[PDB]
Amino acid sequence: YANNKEKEVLVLWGVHHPPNIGDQRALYHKENAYVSVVSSHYSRKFTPEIAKRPK
Amino acid sequence: YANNKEKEVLVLWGVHHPPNIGDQRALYHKENAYVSVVSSHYSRKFTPEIAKRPKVRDQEGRINYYWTLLEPGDTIIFEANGNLIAPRYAFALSRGFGSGIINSNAPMD
Protein backbone atom coordinates (compact mmCIF):
# COMPACT_ATOMS: atom_id res chain seq x y z
CA TYR A 1 0.00 0.00 0.00
CA ALA A 2 1.34 3.41 -1.03
CA ASN A 3 0.30 6.48 0.94
CA ASN A 4 -1.22 9.21 -1.24
CA LYS A 5 -3.51 10.84 1.34
CA GLU A 6 -1.25 13.84 2.12
CA LYS A 7 -1.60 12.68 5.74
CA GLU A 8 -0.09 10.06 8.02
CA VAL A 9 -2.09 6.82 7.83
CA LEU A 10 -2.51 4.52 10.81
CA VAL A 11 -2.12 0.88 9.78
CA LEU A 12 -3.05 -1.93 12.16
CA TRP A 13 -2.42 -5.64 11.67
CA GLY A 14 -1.94 -8.75 13.77
CA VAL A 15 0.00 -11.98 14.06
CA HIS A 16 -1.71 -15.19 15.16
CA HIS A 17 -0.14 -17.67 17.59
CA PRO A 18 -2.10 -20.95 17.60
CA PRO A 19 -2.19 -22.97 20.83
CA ASN A 20 -0.94 -26.27 19.39
CA ILE A 21 0.85 -27.43 16.26
CA GLY A 22 -2.35 -29.07 15.04
CA ASP A 23 -4.13 -25.73 14.78
CA GLN A 24 -1.15 -24.24 12.94
CA ARG A 25 -1.16 -27.06 10.35
CA ALA A 26 -4.96 -26.94 10.02
CA LEU A 27 -5.12 -23.19 9.43
CA TYR A 28 -1.92 -22.24 7.61
CA HIS A 29 -0.50 -25.61 6.42
CA LYS A 30 3.09 -24.61 7.29
CA GLU A 31 5.12 -25.85 10.25
CA ASN A 32 6.79 -22.44 10.56
CA ALA A 33 5.46 -19.17 9.14
CA TYR A 34 6.81 -15.64 8.84
CA VAL A 35 5.20 -12.20 8.65
CA SER A 36 7.39 -9.36 7.36
CA VAL A 37 6.18 -5.76 7.51
CA VAL A 38 8.47 -3.28 5.76
CA SER A 39 8.24 0.48 5.36
CA SER A 40 10.61 3.42 5.01
CA HIS A 41 11.00 3.80 8.79
CA TYR A 42 9.43 0.59 10.17
CA SER A 43 10.58 -2.98 9.60
CA ARG A 44 9.83 -6.13 11.59
CA LYS A 45 9.70 -9.92 11.16
CA PHE A 46 7.30 -12.05 13.19
CA THR A 47 7.26 -15.78 13.74
CA PRO A 48 4.41 -17.79 15.30
CA GLU A 49 5.10 -18.84 18.89
CA ILE A 50 3.02 -21.96 19.47
CA ALA A 51 2.33 -22.34 23.19
CA LYS A 52 -0.43 -23.57 25.49
CA ARG A 53 -1.25 -20.27 27.15
CA PRO A 54 -3.87 -20.01 29.92
CA LYS A 55 -7.43 -19.91 28.66
CA TYR B 1 4.88 -21.99 35.78
CA ALA B 2 1.51 -20.46 36.64
CA ASN B 3 1.36 -17.60 39.13
CA ASN B 4 -1.16 -18.32 41.90
CA LYS B 5 0.17 -15.92 44.54
CA GLU B 6 -1.88 -12.76 43.83
CA LYS B 7 1.49 -10.99 43.77
CA GLU B 8 3.74 -10.19 40.82
CA VAL B 9 6.60 -12.69 40.56
CA LEU B 10 10.10 -11.74 39.41
CA VAL B 11 11.57 -14.47 37.19
CA LEU B 12 15.26 -14.45 36.25
CA TRP B 13 16.99 -16.65 33.69
CA GLY B 14 20.04 -16.61 31.44
CA VAL B 15 21.32 -17.53 28.00
CA HIS B 16 24.84 -18.91 27.61
CA HIS B 17 27.19 -17.98 24.76
CA PRO B 18 30.25 -20.26 24.59
CA PRO B 19 33.52 -18.77 23.31
CA ASN B 20 34.18 -21.45 20.69
CA ILE B 21 32.05 -23.87 18.69
CA GLY B 22 33.71 -26.84 20.37
CA ASP B 23 32.37 -25.74 23.75
CA GLN B 24 28.87 -25.39 22.28
CA ARG B 25 29.03 -28.93 20.85
CA ALA B 26 30.51 -30.36 24.08
CA LEU B 27 27.97 -28.79 26.43
CA TYR B 28 24.76 -28.71 24.40
CA HIS B 29 25.37 -31.16 21.50
CA LYS B 30 23.62 -28.85 19.01
CA GLU B 31 25.40 -26.65 16.47
CA ASN B 32 22.69 -24.00 16.85
CA ALA B 33 20.14 -23.64 19.63
CA TYR B 34 17.15 -21.56 20.67
CA VAL B 35 15.58 -20.39 23.93
CA SER B 36 11.96 -19.24 23.83
CA VAL B 37 10.42 -17.46 26.82
CA VAL B 38 6.69 -16.84 26.41
CA SER B 39 4.22 -15.19 28.77
CA SER B 40 0.92 -13.36 28.38
CA HIS B 41 2.58 -9.95 28.12
CA TYR B 42 6.22 -10.91 27.44
CA SER B 43 7.70 -12.96 24.62
CA ARG B 44 11.26 -13.36 23.38
CA LYS B 45 13.46 -15.73 21.38
CA PHE B 46 17.20 -16.06 21.98
CA THR B 47 19.92 -17.61 19.86
CA PRO B 48 23.45 -18.41 21.09
CA GLU B 49 26.15 -16.16 19.64
CA ILE B 50 29.60 -17.76 19.64
CA ALA B 51 32.41 -15.21 19.90
CA LYS B 52 35.93 -14.93 21.31
CA ARG B 53 35.22 -12.06 23.68
CA PRO B 54 37.88 -10.52 25.95
CA LYS B 55 38.84 -12.67 28.92
CA VAL B 56 37.41 -11.11 32.09
CA ARG B 57 36.94 -13.10 35.31
CA ASP B 58 39.15 -15.76 33.69
CA GLN B 59 36.34 -16.61 31.19
CA GLU B 60 35.72 -15.76 27.49
CA GLY B 61 32.15 -16.99 27.09
CA ARG B 62 29.26 -14.92 28.36
CA ILE B 63 25.86 -15.27 30.03
CA ASN B 64 23.11 -12.77 29.25
CA TYR B 65 20.71 -12.41 32.17
CA TYR B 66 17.04 -11.61 31.59
CA TRP B 67 14.14 -10.91 33.94
CA THR B 68 10.37 -10.59 33.76
CA LEU B 69 7.48 -9.69 36.06
CA LEU B 70 4.60 -12.18 35.98
CA GLU B 71 1.20 -10.73 36.84
CA PRO B 72 -1.19 -12.64 39.11
CA GLY B 73 -3.00 -15.39 37.25
CA ASP B 74 -0.44 -15.54 34.46
CA THR B 75 1.77 -18.29 33.05
CA ILE B 76 5.39 -18.35 31.87
CA ILE B 77 6.74 -20.99 29.49
CA PHE B 78 10.39 -21.87 28.88
CA GLU B 79 11.46 -23.93 25.88
CA ALA B 80 15.05 -24.66 24.92
CA ASN B 81 17.24 -27.13 23.08
CA GLY B 82 20.39 -25.66 24.62
CA ASN B 83 22.06 -22.58 26.13
CA LEU B 84 19.59 -22.01 28.97
CA ILE B 85 20.43 -21.03 32.55
CA ALA B 86 17.08 -22.04 33.98
CA PRO B 87 15.42 -20.24 36.90
CA ARG B 88 15.59 -21.94 40.28
CA TYR B 89 14.17 -19.35 42.69
CA ALA B 90 11.57 -16.69 41.94
CA PHE B 91 10.51 -13.63 43.93
CA ALA B 92 6.91 -12.83 44.84
CA LEU B 93 6.98 -9.11 45.60
CA SER B 94 4.60 -6.18 45.90
CA ARG B 95 6.02 -2.76 45.09
CA GLY B 96 5.72 0.11 47.54
CA PHE B 97 6.63 3.78 47.56
CA GLY B 98 8.95 5.01 44.84
CA SER B 99 12.44 4.94 46.35
CA GLY B 100 16.02 4.64 45.18
CA ILE B 101 19.54 3.34 45.84
CA ILE B 102 21.96 5.30 48.00
CA ASN B 103 25.59 4.67 47.02
CA SER B 104 27.37 5.25 50.33
CA ASN B 105 29.70 3.69 52.89
CA ALA B 106 28.23 4.99 56.15
CA PRO B 107 27.19 3.30 59.40
CA MET B 108 23.66 1.94 59.67
CA ASP B 109 21.68 2.66 62.84
Side-chain angles (χ1 to χ4, degrees), chain A residues 4-29:
Chain A
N4 62 303
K5 303 292 279 242
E6 323 91 59
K7 284 187 262 77
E8 34 185 355
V9 153
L10 181 63
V11 178
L12 298 89
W13 72 94
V15 174
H16 183 212
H17 304 304
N20 45 33
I21 172 69
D23 281 18
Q24 168 76 52
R25 310 211 85 46
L27 287 165
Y28 311 112
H29 300 313

Side-chain angles (χ1 to χ4, degrees), chain B:
Chain B
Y1 176 76
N3 186 30
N4 48 352
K5 300 210 162 228
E6 299 82 56
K7 288 182 307 153
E8 31 173 350
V9 161
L10 167 60
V11 179
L12 294 131
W13 71 93
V15 178
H16 181 226
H17 304 306
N20 77 37
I21 285 269
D23 281 2
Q24 168 75 52
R25 304 217 59 72
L27 272 80
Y28 308 115
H29 306 299
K30 292 179 179 179
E31 185 66 22
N32 82 359
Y34 77 115
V35 176
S36 162
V37 172
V38 172
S39 80
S40 283
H41 268 294
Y42 180 86
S43 157
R44 201 157 164 172
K45 198 191 180 359
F46 313 85
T47 311
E49 336 179 289
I50 316 272
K52 207 93 183 197
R53 259 153 278 187
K55 202 144 44 39
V56 317
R57 299 285 283 139
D58 292 339
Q59 294 300 320
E60 274 168 351
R62 252 72 166 145
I63 295 176
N64 289 353
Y65 306 99
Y66 300 100
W67 63 273
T68 204
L69 254 59
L70 263 160
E71 323 272 57
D74 187 11
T75 302
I76 197 166
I77 298 165
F78 294 85
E79 325 212 335
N81 67 343
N83 301 67
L84 176 62
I85 311 304
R88 200 185 155 186
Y89 286 95
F91 300 100
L93 60 97
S94 45
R95 282 173 278 146
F97 37 87
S99 177
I101 297 106
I102 284 161
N103 287 307
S104 67
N105 33 46
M108 183 189 182
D109 267 20

